[PDB]
Protein backbone atom coordinates (compact mmCIF):
# COMPACT_ATOMS: atom_id res chain seq x y z
CA UNK A 1 0.00 0.00 0.00
CA UNK A 2 0.98 3.72 0.11
CA UNK A 3 4.25 4.83 2.08
CA UNK A 4 2.68 6.75 5.53
CA UNK A 5 1.06 3.59 5.79
CA UNK A 6 4.39 2.05 7.26
CA UNK A 7 3.99 4.83 10.09
CA UNK A 8 1.07 2.98 11.46
CA UNK A 9 1.99 -1.09 11.48
CA UNK A 10 3.18 -0.02 14.99
CA UNK A 11 1.44 1.45 18.85
CA UNK A 12 1.71 5.14 17.64
CA UNK A 13 1.55 8.23 20.73
CA UNK A 14 -1.28 10.39 19.88
CA UNK A 15 -1.65 14.26 21.07
CA UNK A 16 -4.85 16.12 20.93
CA UNK A 17 -5.15 19.68 21.43
CA UNK A 18 -8.20 22.04 21.15
CA UNK A 19 -9.23 25.22 21.79
CA UNK A 20 -12.61 25.86 21.64
CA UNK A 21 -14.92 29.11 21.94
CA UNK A 22 -18.72 28.41 22.21
CA UNK A 23 -21.25 31.55 22.43
CA UNK A 24 -18.06 33.13 24.34
CA UNK A 25 -17.52 30.35 26.63
CA UNK A 26 -13.88 29.96 25.82
CA UNK A 27 -12.24 26.06 27.15
CA UNK A 28 -9.04 24.39 26.14
CA UNK A 29 -9.20 20.21 26.13
CA UNK A 30 -5.44 18.37 26.28
CA UNK A 31 -5.65 14.84 24.98
CA UNK A 32 -2.79 12.10 25.20
CA UNK A 33 -3.21 8.17 24.32
CA UNK A 34 -2.25 5.27 22.01
CA UNK A 35 -3.23 4.88 18.14
CA UNK A 36 -3.15 0.83 16.74
CA UNK A 37 -3.78 1.13 12.99
CA UNK A 38 -3.14 -2.69 12.83
CA UNK A 39 -6.38 -3.68 15.25
CA UNK A 40 -8.27 0.18 14.59
CA UNK A 41 -8.21 0.83 17.93
CA UNK A 42 -7.53 4.06 19.95
CA UNK A 43 -7.78 4.78 23.90
CA UNK A 44 -7.25 8.34 24.19
CA UNK A 45 -7.98 10.14 28.34
CA UNK A 46 -9.00 14.12 27.64
CA UNK A 47 -8.88 16.61 30.06
CA UNK A 48 -10.42 19.96 30.10
CA UNK A 49 -7.68 22.50 31.07
CA UNK A 50 -9.50 25.43 31.44
CA UNK A 51 -11.96 23.93 34.65
CA UNK A 52 -15.41 23.34 33.14
CA UNK A 53 -16.25 21.75 30.08
CA UNK A 54 -19.47 24.40 28.57
CA UNK A 55 -20.66 21.76 26.39
CA UNK A 56 -21.08 17.88 26.94
CA UNK A 57 -18.24 15.70 26.43
CA UNK A 58 -20.29 13.25 23.27
CA UNK A 59 -20.39 16.76 21.47
CA UNK A 60 -16.51 17.13 21.06
CA UNK A 61 -16.02 12.88 20.44
CA UNK A 62 -15.89 13.46 17.04
CA UNK A 63 -13.76 16.88 16.68
CA UNK A 64 -11.27 15.05 18.98
CA UNK A 65 -8.32 11.10 13.85
CA UNK A 66 -9.32 8.76 11.48
CA UNK A 67 -5.59 8.08 10.33
CA UNK A 68 -6.14 5.08 13.20
CA UNK A 69 -8.55 3.32 10.79
CA UNK A 70 -8.52 -0.30 10.08
CA UNK A 71 -8.63 -0.43 6.35
CA UNK A 72 -9.01 -4.16 4.72
CA UNK A 73 -6.22 -5.66 2.46
CA UNK A 74 -8.73 -4.80 -0.46
CA UNK A 75 -9.47 -1.43 0.43
CA UNK A 76 -5.92 -0.20 1.34
CA UNK A 77 -6.04 1.88 -2.01
CA UNK A 78 -8.71 3.37 -0.38
CA UNK A 79 -6.51 5.14 2.87
CA UNK A 80 -6.16 8.86 2.31
CA UNK A 81 -5.50 9.63 5.61
CA UNK A 82 -2.67 7.28 5.98
CA UNK A 83 -1.55 8.43 2.90
CA UNK A 84 -1.29 12.00 3.89
CA UNK A 85 1.33 11.17 6.36
CA UNK A 86 3.93 12.25 7.30
CA UNK A 87 2.99 15.60 6.32
CA UNK A 88 -0.24 15.31 7.10
CA UNK A 89 -3.94 16.89 6.30
CA UNK A 90 -5.97 19.82 7.43
CA UNK A 91 -9.44 18.38 8.53
CA UNK A 92 -12.76 21.35 9.02
CA UNK A 93 -15.90 20.51 9.20
CA UNK A 94 -19.56 22.32 9.87
CA UNK A 95 -21.62 20.24 12.91
CA UNK A 96 -25.27 21.45 12.82
CA UNK A 97 -27.28 20.46 16.09
CA UNK A 98 -30.87 20.91 14.93
CA UNK A 99 -32.91 23.32 16.41
CA UNK A 100 -29.39 24.50 18.14
CA UNK A 101 -26.27 26.04 17.44
CA UNK A 102 -23.46 25.33 14.85
CA UNK A 103 -20.08 23.97 15.38
CA UNK A 104 -17.12 25.21 12.83
CA UNK A 105 -13.80 23.10 13.30
CA UNK A 106 -10.57 23.19 11.68
CA UNK A 107 -7.84 21.25 12.71
CA UNK A 108 -4.19 19.85 11.55
CA UNK A 109 -3.24 16.09 11.75
CA UNK A 110 0.48 15.51 11.40
CA UNK A 111 2.86 13.57 12.57
CA UNK A 112 5.44 15.80 14.93
CA UNK A 113 8.60 13.49 15.83
CA UNK A 114 7.05 10.10 16.59
CA UNK A 115 3.53 11.33 18.01
CA UNK A 116 0.41 11.92 15.46
CA UNK A 117 -1.26 15.32 17.03
CA UNK A 118 -4.18 16.62 15.80
CA UNK A 119 -4.41 20.46 16.98
CA UNK A 120 -8.12 21.75 16.79
CA UNK A 121 -9.74 24.98 16.73
CA UNK A 122 -13.50 25.27 17.64
CA UNK A 123 -16.52 27.58 17.29
CA UNK A 124 -19.54 27.64 18.49
CA UNK A 125 -22.51 29.94 17.50
CA UNK A 126 -26.02 30.48 17.82
CA UNK A 127 -26.58 28.09 20.90
CA UNK A 128 -29.93 27.84 22.90
CA UNK A 129 -28.77 28.74 26.50
CA UNK A 130 -31.66 26.48 27.33
CA UNK A 131 -31.14 23.76 24.99
CA UNK A 132 -29.76 20.16 25.49
CA UNK A 133 -26.02 21.64 24.46
CA UNK A 134 -25.57 24.58 26.64
CA UNK A 135 -28.43 22.66 29.06
CA UNK A 136 -26.01 19.62 29.12
CA UNK A 137 -29.40 17.30 28.89
CA UNK A 138 -26.86 14.84 26.89
CA UNK A 139 -26.32 11.48 27.77
CA UNK A 140 -22.63 10.40 28.57
CA UNK A 141 -22.36 7.77 25.72
CA UNK A 142 -22.27 7.28 22.24
CA UNK A 143 -24.76 5.23 21.46
CA UNK A 144 -26.75 4.90 18.76
CA UNK A 145 -29.80 3.35 19.93
CA UNK A 146 -37.30 -2.85 21.23
CA UNK A 147 -33.47 -2.94 21.03
CA UNK A 148 -33.92 -2.78 25.67
CA UNK A 149 -35.84 -5.76 25.60
CA UNK A 150 -33.66 -7.40 23.39
CA UNK A 151 -30.98 -6.94 25.35
CA UNK A 152 -32.74 -7.73 28.45
CA UNK A 153 -33.71 -10.48 25.78
CA UNK A 154 -30.04 -12.04 25.97
CA UNK A 155 -28.88 -11.73 28.94
CA UNK A 156 -31.07 -13.88 30.28
CA UNK A 157 -31.17 -16.42 27.52
CA UNK A 158 -27.25 -16.31 27.86
CA UNK A 159 -27.99 -17.07 32.13
CA UNK A 160 -30.54 -19.69 31.40
CA UNK A 161 -28.36 -21.66 29.14
CA UNK A 162 -25.37 -21.05 31.28
CA UNK A 163 -27.11 -23.13 34.23
CA UNK A 164 -28.42 -25.68 32.25
CA UNK A 165 -25.42 -27.01 30.42
CA UNK A 166 -23.27 -25.97 34.05
CA UNK A 167 -25.62 -28.81 36.03
CA UNK A 168 -25.11 -31.49 32.63
CA UNK A 169 -21.31 -30.86 33.59
CA UNK A 170 -21.87 -31.94 37.11
CA UNK A 171 -23.31 -35.00 35.85
CA UNK A 172 -20.87 -35.49 33.20
CA UNK A 173 -18.26 -34.86 35.83
CA UNK A 174 -19.40 -37.54 38.08
CA UNK A 175 -19.72 -39.88 35.68
CA UNK A 176 -15.87 -39.36 34.45
CA UNK A 177 -15.17 -40.02 37.85
CA UNK A 178 -16.44 -42.81 38.38
CA UNK A 179 -15.06 -44.02 34.75
CA UNK A 180 -11.01 -43.06 35.97
CA UNK A 181 -11.58 -44.89 39.34
CA UNK A 182 -13.04 -47.65 37.44
CA UNK A 183 -10.27 -47.49 34.62
CA UNK A 184 -7.66 -47.46 37.40
CA UNK A 185 -9.55 -49.60 39.52
CA UNK A 186 -8.87 -52.77 36.91
CA UNK A 187 -5.65 -51.44 35.17
CA UNK A 188 -3.94 -51.63 38.73
CA UNK A 189 -6.05 -54.54 39.59
CA UNK A 190 -7.09 -52.56 43.14
CA UNK A 191 -10.12 -55.44 42.75
CA UNK A 192 -9.82 -58.66 40.54
CA UNK A 193 -11.02 -58.80 37.37
CA UNK A 194 -14.06 -60.49 37.93
CA UNK A 195 -14.86 -58.02 40.16
CA UNK A 196 -14.22 -54.76 37.60
CA UNK A 197 -13.97 -55.91 34.02
CA UNK A 198 -10.62 -53.88 32.14
CA UNK A 199 -13.07 -51.39 29.96
CA UNK A 200 -14.36 -51.52 26.03
CA UNK A 201 -12.02 -49.95 23.64
CA UNK A 202 -14.15 -46.75 23.83
CA UNK A 203 -13.64 -46.25 27.36
CA UNK A 204 -10.14 -44.30 26.53
CA UNK A 205 -10.84 -42.00 24.31
CA UNK A 206 -14.21 -40.64 26.23
CA UNK A 207 -11.35 -40.30 29.38
CA UNK A 208 -10.86 -37.00 26.74
CA UNK A 209 -14.47 -36.15 27.21
CA UNK A 210 -13.31 -33.46 30.28
CA UNK A 211 -11.63 -31.03 27.49
CA UNK A 212 -15.04 -29.66 26.05
CA UNK A 213 -16.57 -30.00 29.69
CA UNK A 214 -14.03 -27.85 31.08
CA UNK A 215 -13.46 -25.39 27.79
CA UNK A 216 -17.18 -24.70 28.57
CA UNK A 217 -17.06 -23.86 31.90
CA UNK A 218 -14.06 -22.05 30.62
CA UNK A 219 -16.11 -19.51 28.23
CA UNK A 220 -19.19 -18.76 31.33
CA UNK A 221 -17.06 -15.84 33.54
CA UNK A 222 -16.55 -14.08 30.63
CA UNK A 223 -18.94 -15.20 27.66
CA UNK A 224 -15.51 -16.34 25.33
CA UNK A 225 -17.20 -17.10 22.42
CA UNK A 226 -13.76 -18.72 21.05
CA UNK A 227 -13.96 -21.23 24.57
CA UNK A 228 -17.31 -22.42 23.57
CA UNK A 229 -16.82 -22.86 19.73
CA UNK A 230 -13.80 -24.95 20.93
CA UNK A 231 -15.92 -27.11 23.62
CA UNK A 232 -18.99 -27.78 20.30
CA UNK A 233 -15.79 -29.20 18.31
CA UNK A 234 -14.37 -31.23 20.69
CA UNK A 235 -17.29 -32.15 22.20
CA UNK A 236 -18.78 -33.83 18.71
CA UNK A 237 -14.82 -35.64 18.77
CA UNK A 238 -14.07 -36.73 22.31
CA UNK A 239 -17.40 -36.74 24.17
CA UNK A 240 -19.93 -37.84 21.23
CA UNK A 241 -17.96 -39.81 18.82
CA UNK A 242 -16.48 -42.34 21.26
CA UNK A 243 -20.50 -43.07 22.66
CA UNK A 244 -21.24 -43.93 18.94
CA UNK A 245 -18.23 -45.96 18.19
CA UNK A 246 -19.10 -47.52 21.67
CA UNK A 247 -22.56 -48.39 20.83
CA UNK A 248 -21.07 -50.64 17.74
CA UNK A 249 -17.90 -51.98 19.73
CA UNK A 250 -20.58 -53.24 22.53
CA UNK A 251 -22.52 -54.54 19.90
CA UNK A 252 -21.15 -58.20 19.36
CA UNK A 253 -21.13 -58.98 23.26
CA UNK A 254 -24.75 -58.03 23.62
CA UNK A 255 -25.70 -60.14 20.84
CA UNK A 256 -23.79 -62.99 22.73
CA UNK A 257 -25.52 -61.83 26.16
CA UNK A 258 -28.99 -61.78 24.72
CA UNK A 259 -28.85 -64.98 22.60
CA UNK A 260 -26.38 -67.27 23.77
CA UNK A 261 -26.91 -65.95 27.19
CA UNK A 262 -23.11 -66.28 27.67
CA UNK A 263 -21.11 -63.05 29.22
CA UNK A 264 -17.43 -62.34 29.34
CA UNK A 265 -16.86 -59.47 31.69
CA UNK A 266 -18.53 -58.38 35.06
CA UNK A 267 -19.45 -55.44 36.69
CA UNK A 268 -19.88 -56.05 40.70
CA UNK A 269 -22.43 -59.62 39.94
CA UNK A 270 -23.59 -58.00 36.60
CA UNK A 271 -22.62 -58.41 32.99
CA UNK A 272 -19.99 -55.62 32.19
CA UNK A 273 -22.17 -54.85 28.55
CA UNK A 274 -25.55 -54.56 29.94
CA UNK A 275 -24.17 -51.87 32.89
CA UNK A 276 -21.87 -49.86 30.49
CA UNK A 277 -24.56 -49.84 27.66
CA UNK A 278 -26.54 -48.06 30.35
CA UNK A 279 -23.99 -45.96 30.80
CA UNK A 280 -23.54 -45.37 27.24
CA UNK A 281 -27.41 -44.34 27.08
CA UNK A 282 -26.81 -41.78 29.97
CA UNK A 283 -24.31 -40.10 28.91
CA UNK A 284 -24.98 -39.78 25.12
CA UNK A 285 -28.25 -38.04 26.74
CA UNK A 286 -26.27 -35.40 28.97
CA UNK A 287 -23.73 -34.79 26.09
CA UNK A 288 -26.52 -33.91 23.54
CA UNK A 289 -28.60 -31.86 25.56
CA UNK A 290 -24.56 -30.28 25.91
CA UNK A 291 -24.14 -30.07 22.82
CA UNK A 292 -27.88 -28.14 22.27
CA UNK A 293 -27.79 -26.08 24.34
CA UNK A 294 -24.22 -24.77 23.90
CA UNK A 295 -25.27 -23.83 20.11
CA UNK A 296 -28.37 -21.98 21.05
CA UNK A 297 -25.41 -20.22 23.82
CA UNK A 298 -23.68 -19.84 20.69
CA UNK A 299 -25.99 -18.01 18.85
CA UNK A 300 -26.90 -16.11 21.41
CA UNK A 301 -23.49 -14.58 22.21
CA UNK A 302 -23.23 -13.98 18.80
CA UNK A 303 -26.61 -12.24 18.00
CA UNK A 304 -26.33 -10.36 21.13
CA UNK A 305 -22.47 -9.02 20.65
CA UNK A 306 -23.08 -8.55 16.92
CA UNK A 307 -26.70 -6.48 17.90
CA UNK A 308 -24.74 -4.43 20.30
CA UNK A 309 -22.24 -3.66 17.80
CA UNK A 310 -24.53 -2.98 15.12
CA UNK A 311 -26.15 -0.18 17.58
CA UNK A 312 -23.24 1.56 19.42
CA UNK A 313 -21.61 2.11 15.55
CA UNK A 314 -21.53 5.43 13.56
CA UNK A 315 -20.74 4.86 9.78
CA UNK A 316 -18.89 7.72 7.91
CA UNK A 317 -19.45 7.75 4.81
CA UNK A 318 -16.40 9.32 2.72
CA UNK A 319 -16.50 10.50 -0.71
CA UNK A 320 -13.38 11.74 -3.09
CA UNK A 321 -13.39 15.52 -3.42
CA UNK A 322 -11.07 16.02 -6.47
CA UNK A 323 -11.32 19.56 -7.04
CA UNK A 324 -9.66 19.76 -3.82
CA UNK A 325 -7.43 16.99 -3.91
CA UNK A 326 -8.94 15.15 -0.65
CA UNK A 327 -11.75 13.76 0.48
CA UNK A 328 -15.72 14.63 2.21
CA UNK A 329 -17.34 13.14 4.56
CA UNK A 330 -21.08 13.15 5.74
CA UNK A 331 -23.22 11.95 8.60
CA UNK A 332 -25.38 12.28 11.38
CA UNK A 333 -24.07 11.79 14.94
CA UNK A 334 -27.60 11.33 17.24
CA UNK A 335 -26.79 12.21 20.59
CA UNK A 336 -29.12 10.65 23.42
CA UNK A 337 -31.03 13.27 25.21
CA UNK A 338 -32.01 12.27 28.94
CA UNK A 339 -35.64 12.74 28.81
CA UNK A 340 -35.17 9.30 26.22
CA UNK A 341 -34.55 11.13 22.94
CA UNK A 342 -32.86 11.80 20.38
CA UNK A 343 -30.43 15.25 19.38
CA UNK A 344 -29.01 15.19 15.71
CA UNK A 345 -25.80 16.43 15.05
CA UNK A 346 -24.99 17.05 10.95
CA UNK A 347 -21.68 16.37 10.13
CA UNK A 348 -20.10 17.95 6.96
CA UNK A 349 -16.44 17.33 6.95
CA UNK A 350 -13.57 18.05 4.05
CA UNK A 351 -10.22 16.84 4.59
CA UNK A 352 -6.88 18.61 2.42
CA UNK A 353 -3.28 17.11 2.65
CA UNK A 354 -0.93 19.36 4.07
CA UNK A 355 2.09 18.65 1.90
CA UNK A 356 2.96 18.50 -1.75
CA UNK A 357 2.72 15.25 -2.85
CA UNK A 358 0.87 12.19 -4.01
CA UNK A 359 -2.43 11.04 -1.98
CA UNK A 360 -5.02 8.12 -2.40
CA UNK A 361 -8.32 9.77 -3.71
CA UNK A 362 -10.85 6.67 -2.79
CA UNK A 363 -14.27 4.98 -4.40
CA UNK A 364 -17.25 5.76 -2.14
CA UNK A 365 -17.00 3.96 0.95
CA UNK A 366 -17.16 4.09 5.07
CA UNK A 367 -15.80 3.89 7.71
CA UNK A 368 -17.75 1.77 10.51
CA UNK A 369 -17.30 4.07 14.13
CA UNK A 370 -17.24 2.42 17.88
CA UNK A 371 -17.05 4.75 20.47
CA UNK A 372 -17.25 3.76 24.06
CA UNK A 373 -17.36 6.36 26.95
CA UNK A 374 -16.21 5.92 30.49
CA UNK A 375 -14.22 7.85 33.58
CA UNK A 376 -11.63 7.90 35.72
CA UNK A 377 -12.02 7.30 39.31
CA UNK A 378 -8.89 9.31 40.46
CA UNK A 379 -9.36 11.82 38.23
CA UNK A 380 -10.66 15.31 39.71
CA UNK A 381 -10.95 17.55 36.79
CA UNK A 382 -13.65 17.34 33.76
CA UNK A 383 -12.54 15.15 32.00
CA UNK A 384 -13.43 11.99 29.58
CA UNK A 385 -11.62 8.17 28.70
CA UNK A 386 -12.22 7.24 25.86
CA UNK A 387 -11.74 4.13 23.35
CA UNK A 388 -12.71 3.41 19.84
CA UNK A 389 -12.32 1.04 17.34
CA UNK A 390 -12.90 2.27 13.40
CA UNK A 391 -13.29 -0.16 10.60
CA UNK A 392 -13.50 0.54 6.88
CA UNK A 393 -16.36 -1.47 4.93
CA UNK A 394 -18.00 0.32 2.18
CA UNK A 395 -16.47 -1.69 -0.54
CA UNK A 396 -17.19 -5.50 -1.29
CA UNK A 397 -15.44 -4.84 -4.86
Not at 110 to 129: A, H, M, Q, S, W
Not at 134 to 159: D, I, P
Not at 185 to 208: C, K, N, T
Not at 266 to 295: D, E
Request: charged residues 20%; glycine residues 6%.
Amino acid sequence: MSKGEELFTGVVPILVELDGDVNGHKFSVRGEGEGDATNGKLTLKFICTTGKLPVPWPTLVTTLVQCFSRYPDHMKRHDFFKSAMPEGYVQERTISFKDDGTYKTRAEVKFEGDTLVNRIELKGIDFKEDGNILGHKLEYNMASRQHRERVAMHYQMSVTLKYEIKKLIYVHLVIWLLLVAKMSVGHLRLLSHDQVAMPYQWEYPYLLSILPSLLGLLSFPRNNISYLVLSMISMGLFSIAPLIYGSMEMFPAAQQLYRHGKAYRFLFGFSAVSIMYLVLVLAVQVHAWQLYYSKKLLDSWFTSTQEKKHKNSHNVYITADKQKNGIKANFKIRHNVEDGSVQLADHYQQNTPIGDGPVLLPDNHYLSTQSVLSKDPNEKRDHMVLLEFVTAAGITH
